[PDB]
Design an enzyme around this catalytic site. Structure first.
Site, PDB file in Angstrom:
ATOM      1  N   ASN A 164     -10.011   0.416  -1.518  1.00 30.03           N
ATOM      2  CA  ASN A 164      -8.562   0.502  -1.370  1.00 30.03           C
ATOM      3  C   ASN A 164      -7.936  -0.322  -2.491  1.00 30.03           C
ATOM      4  O   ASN A 164      -7.872  -1.551  -2.428  1.00 30.03           O
ATOM      5  CB  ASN A 164      -8.164   0.035   0.025  1.00 30.03           C
ATOM      6  CG  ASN A 164      -6.654   0.069   0.268  1.00 30.03           C
ATOM      7  OD1 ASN A 164      -5.855   0.251  -0.653  1.00 30.03           O
ATOM      8  ND2 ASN A 164      -6.267  -0.052   1.542  1.00 30.03           N
ATOM      9  N   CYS A 173       0.794  -1.223   0.000  1.00 29.45           N
ATOM     10  CA  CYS A 173       0.000   0.000   0.000  1.00 29.45           C
ATOM     11  C   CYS A 173       0.829   1.276   0.000  1.00 29.45           C
ATOM     12  O   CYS A 173       0.244   2.353  -0.131  1.00 29.45           O
ATOM     13  CB  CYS A 173      -0.968   0.023   1.191  1.00 29.45           C
ATOM     14  SG  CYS A 173      -2.371  -1.108   1.077  1.00 29.45           S
ATOM     15  N   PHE A 227     -10.111  -4.054   0.106  1.00 27.95           N
ATOM     16  CA  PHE A 227      -9.321  -4.016  -1.118  1.00 27.95           C
ATOM     17  C   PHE A 227     -10.169  -4.256  -2.363  1.00 27.95           C
ATOM     18  O   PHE A 227     -10.976  -5.194  -2.416  1.00 27.95           O
ATOM     19  CB  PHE A 227      -8.195  -5.040  -1.034  1.00 27.95           C
ATOM     20  CG  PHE A 227      -7.253  -4.799   0.118  1.00 27.95           C
ATOM     21  CD1 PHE A 227      -6.466  -3.652   0.166  1.00 27.95           C
ATOM     22  CD2 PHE A 227      -7.160  -5.725   1.152  1.00 27.95           C
ATOM     23  CE1 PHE A 227      -5.615  -3.435   1.214  1.00 27.95           C
ATOM     24  CE2 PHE A 227      -6.285  -5.520   2.201  1.00 27.95           C
ATOM     25  CZ  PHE A 227      -5.525  -4.366   2.238  1.00 27.95           C
ATOM     26  N   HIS A 274      -2.622   8.143   1.252  1.00 24.44           N
ATOM     27  CA  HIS A 274      -3.182   6.851   0.867  1.00 24.44           C
ATOM     28  C   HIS A 274      -4.342   6.500   1.803  1.00 24.44           C
ATOM     29  O   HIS A 274      -4.190   6.585   3.026  1.00 24.44           O
ATOM     30  CB  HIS A 274      -2.106   5.767   0.899  1.00 24.44           C
ATOM     31  CG  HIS A 274      -2.649   4.385   0.740  1.00 24.44           C
ATOM     32  ND1 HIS A 274      -3.129   3.913  -0.461  1.00 24.44           N
ATOM     33  CD2 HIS A 274      -2.810   3.380   1.633  1.00 24.44           C
ATOM     34  CE1 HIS A 274      -3.565   2.677  -0.302  1.00 24.44           C
ATOM     35  NE2 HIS A 274      -3.378   2.326   0.961  1.00 24.44           N
ATOM     36  N   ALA A 329     -10.062   4.960   9.311  1.00 27.81           N
ATOM     37  CA  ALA A 329      -9.477   5.299  10.607  1.00 27.81           C
ATOM     38  C   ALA A 329      -8.118   5.971  10.454  1.00 27.81           C
ATOM     39  O   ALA A 329      -7.803   6.921  11.182  1.00 27.81           O
ATOM     40  CB  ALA A 329      -9.336   4.038  11.461  1.00 27.81           C
TER      41      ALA A 329
END
Lengths: 390, 390
Positions: free
Chosen positions: A337, A162, A213, A304, A309
């Protein structure tokens, strides 16, 4: 004369993003029904208390939908993939090894079309995925699909997770700036079926991964010394630095196993990132002799979106107003994501909007900004950007 | 002033190799008894004609011995690894994920010792392996083992195979040259147990792999603007270009499967490389405005020893004298084919021999030379070197 060769070889100016293209696979999964699909596709509807837990987690993600290269019918052919850990890497590789460069190439064609120069002027290819590995590697396949010149310099950025959206910008900076005339095609492409798996109550963290994801690809053209009137310079990559946070190796880790890529996470990623991001920001400013702004709201931001959170806590720590992460939260809502592709999608969203809103620069009318990747290590990629007039 | 930042950020001179360290695992396997060991350890002595062919191949390798991180007793613990294709990737990863950065770090410690400056002055790490993958990746683990600074810029060169010794030089060139004061630690490390497997008669090519590959690690310090009186500049990396040879994808390919890394090769690699190397060499000279020499014997040579047949045919094609690949053949004899590490070992052998013989330059007394990586694709890495006074 070795020094004369060096002087003639290198570029003059700062590496600049001058085109952005993106591409999704065709199957759209709304988040509000994802728990229903997932527990059905994994034959786990008897795990009723687990299923509510997962539905509540999905409702908290601030993800609206995700795109995938498979649908429910497709997965029925692979009961091994929808199990927790039956042997499955071979099947996942058979999908991801050809599939990831193909999706990446779709994004690359769009970036090249926006750029408007012949693909024969591409001198470097930086290809990035955490979804499958092979020899020759995914960069080779993408270059073949696109018909790049046979002597393009390639960079295959495998399994950087990531933070890798930041990693490829760091690569592209030095490649573009050290080579006169260089035009760097950057491609990030992810097919998360490499890691999709059924739920197991002893690995709740592995399960939450299936709430976050999604698939996607993004591509850039990066180069120094833009041809004025022809090329479209948008963001200059002024400084790029990678940082490891000590004593956080157990926060996020992923292992390539016979059951595919196995994702694990503690609950500490939001606090680990927020407690360390300021030092990373100071570092990148001081490394080019600049003083960090007294108010972090003076910059534009591409963090990103590893989790809602993470965004909330970094927003709080930096005392940012709620609108500063608008572009990031929009992509997270629309796409989930997408690992390395996210920050490039967000750069695209920000610059498109800034033009729609007729602002003074591509960076929401502000001059300076930071793009941040976060991932296993824990690792932070910090990219200091200077945006250009619109 | 963005351009002022750029001018201050970049280095002045050409990237220079200024230290080389190497390390092997401890177990030595003589080639003249390897066929005996291999067919015993893989429980394959009933394959009598297979063993005869394999012994004949081992005699033709021009490899004297190889180093491995395992002995015969160790392998008895892993009947899955010594089979042809039983599930074994997890066991291989458990060995290679920690083992490869550890071996790499050992070579790095020797390079850093030769360099003689504090490890805190290393600003970039390029880590290369084709033996195992993980998140966080092998570069993270090596940097941790070494105690590098937390904001070292890392580059993980995974699964680039036998050309990757050239690849890491290509990376290091741009990193060192675009960053004032940057010192690049380059590490190549390989533990071939990722792909070790028993023989199967329908895959003779895969079996031949076990006659070639051995373990090893090599490390460089690369930097621009050497500190005179402190650093030891040896080879300047003037030009670095990667080339793909069309229509040769099946010549060498390796796949990461549930049975570990699966190696495959046709018989066409010696002729595919030899028919294309001249074009690659012309390219690297013309790309810096130099005319290639009329006689290739005017250069010094570091070809990757992918197979003795590759070396013989390239030597013939370039009309080279028999001594020109002496350093390469010495390393192949002493170590076998250590994948990405070979060319770095050969550079070490060449510069050490050149000093022993009191020659005019580190490159066998010659000024210009080429380092070549060859591997899957087929891919050629062509590195144009200028060697310095000894």
């Amino acid at each position: 004369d070795v020094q004369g060769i060096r002087k003639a070889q290198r570029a003059d100016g700062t590496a600049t993003v001058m085109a952005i293209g993106t591409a999704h696979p065709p199957h759209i999964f709304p988040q509000d029904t994802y728990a229903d699909f997932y527990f059905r596709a994994t034959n786990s509807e008897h795990k009723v208390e687990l299923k509510k837990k997962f539905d509540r987690i999905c409702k908290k993600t601030m993800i609206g939908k995700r795109y995938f290269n498979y649908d429910e019918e497709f997965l029925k052919k692979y009961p091994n993939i929808t199990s927790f850990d039956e042997p499955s890497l071979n099947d996942r590789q058979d999908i991801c090894v050809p599939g990831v460069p193909a999706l990446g190439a779709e994004a690359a064609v769009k970036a090249i079309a926006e750029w408007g120069r012949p693909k024969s002027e591409i001198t470097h290819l930086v290809f990035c995925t955490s979804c499958g590995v092979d020899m020759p590697s995914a960069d080779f396949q993408c270059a073949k699909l696109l018909g790049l010149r046979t002597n393009v310099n390639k960079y295959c950025v495998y399994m950087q997770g990531c933070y890798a959206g930041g990693t490829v910008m760091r690569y592209a900076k030095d490649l573009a700036e050290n080579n006169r005339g260089a035009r760097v095609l950057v491609v990030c492409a992810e097919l998360t079926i490499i890691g999709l798996r059924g739920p197991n109550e002893s690995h709740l963290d592995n399960a939450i991964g299936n709430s976050l994801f999604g698939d996607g690809a993004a591509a850039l053209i990066v180069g120094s010394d833009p041809i004025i009137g022809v090329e479209k310079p948008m963001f200059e990559i002024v400084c790029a630095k990678q940082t490891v946070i000590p004593n956080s190796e157990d926060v996020i880790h992923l292992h390539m196993r016979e059951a595919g890529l196995m994702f694990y996470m503690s609950k500490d990623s939001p606090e680990t990132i927020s407690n360390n991001v300021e030092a990373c920001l100071v570092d990148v400013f001081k490394s080019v002799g600049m003083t960090p702004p007294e108010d972090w709201n003076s910059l534009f931001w591409i963090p990103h979106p590893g989790g809602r959170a993470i965004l909330d806590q970094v927003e709080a720590k930096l005392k940012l107003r709620p609108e500063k992460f608008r572009a990031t939260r929009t992509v997270l809502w629309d796409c989930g994501n997408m690992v390395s592709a996210c920050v490039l999608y967000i750069l695209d969203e920000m610059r498109r909007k800034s033009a729609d809103e007729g602002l003074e620069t591509y960076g929401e009318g502000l001059e300076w900004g930071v793009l941040l990747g976060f991932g296993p290590g824990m690792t932070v990629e910090t990219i200091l950007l200077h945006s250009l007039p619109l």
